[PDB]
Design an enzyme around this catalytic site. Structure first.
Site, PDB file in Angstrom:
ATOM      1  N   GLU A  11       0.783  -1.225   0.000  1.00 57.75           N
ATOM      2  CA  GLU A  11       0.000   0.000   0.000  1.00 57.75           C
ATOM      3  C   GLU A  11       0.821   1.286   0.000  1.00 57.75           C
ATOM      4  O   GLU A  11       0.261   2.313  -0.326  1.00 57.75           O
ATOM      5  CB  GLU A  11      -0.798   0.041   1.304  1.00 57.75           C
ATOM      6  CG  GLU A  11      -1.965  -0.941   1.223  1.00 57.75           C
ATOM      7  CD  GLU A  11      -3.002  -0.675   0.172  1.00 57.75           C
ATOM      8  OE1 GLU A  11      -3.090   0.337  -0.494  1.00 57.75           O
ATOM      9  OE2 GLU A  11      -3.849  -1.655   0.107  1.00 57.75           O
ATOM     10  N   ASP A  20      -6.421   6.691  -5.069  1.00 59.89           N
ATOM     11  CA  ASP A  20      -5.898   5.355  -5.209  1.00 59.89           C
ATOM     12  C   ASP A  20      -5.967   4.907  -6.666  1.00 59.89           C
ATOM     13  O   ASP A  20      -6.360   5.664  -7.536  1.00 59.89           O
ATOM     14  CB  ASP A  20      -6.559   4.405  -4.210  1.00 59.89           C
ATOM     15  CG  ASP A  20      -7.984   4.168  -4.590  1.00 59.89           C
ATOM     16  OD1 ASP A  20      -8.482   4.639  -5.574  1.00 59.89           O
ATOM     17  OD2 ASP A  20      -8.618   3.352  -3.787  1.00 59.89           O
TER      18      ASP A  20
END
Ligand SMILES: [Cl-]
Ligand SMILES: [Cl-]
Length: 162
Positions: A11, A20
């Site tokens: 991540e 994202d």
């Protein structure tokens, strides 16, 4: 290696709001803020999560804190899930970390939808589940990460992260 380190790898860590891979506002260590298109909505969810007027930026410490909560929540979501729990209970420690990762990225609901794979993992049919897992939007959209997770389920080792 462990769940935290594993996810920190997949991540990354960003202290300023960002978008994202699906274009949603996120911050920290993969902490989704909102699916809305509004940056303010995002800023607002941020302040509320942290407990202060942040102006879209946060500290390392705050990031780590949300990250710990998010992991905890994922595990807990797994345990409360009638389809997931049993899978998780049948797995060894490494593989459980793989299931947590998926849950963290996609939500319990998303994951609970891979019925067939789940069943296969429950039966310890590694190579077959890995094949089945790959036939998914998830794999097609974030193939490097999916590969890492999938290898982890296939091998029961951390080699994909070494
Ligand atoms: Cl929160
Ligand atoms: Cl990827």
């Amino acid at each position: 290696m462990n769940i935290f380190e594993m996810l920190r790898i997949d991540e990354g860590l960003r202290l300023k709001i960002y978008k994202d891979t699906e274009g949603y506002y996120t911050i920290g260590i993969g902490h989704l803020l909102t699916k809305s298109p509004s940056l303010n909505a995002a800023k607002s969810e941020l302040d509320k999560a942290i407990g202060r007027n942040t102006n879209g930026v946060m500290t390392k410490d705050e990031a780590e804190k949300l990250f710990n909560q998010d992991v905890d929540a994922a595990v807990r979501g797994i345990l409360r899930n009638a389809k997931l729990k049993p899978v998780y209970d049948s797995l060894d420690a490494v593989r459980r970390a793989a299931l947590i990762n998926m849950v963290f990225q996609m939500g319990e609901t998303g994951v609970a939808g891979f019925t067939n794979s789940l069943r296969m993992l429950q039966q310890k049919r590694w190579d077959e589940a890995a094949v089945n897992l790959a036939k998914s939007r998830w794999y097609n959209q974030t193939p490097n990460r999916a590969k890492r997770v999938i290898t982890t389920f296939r091998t029961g080792t951390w080699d994909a992260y070494k």
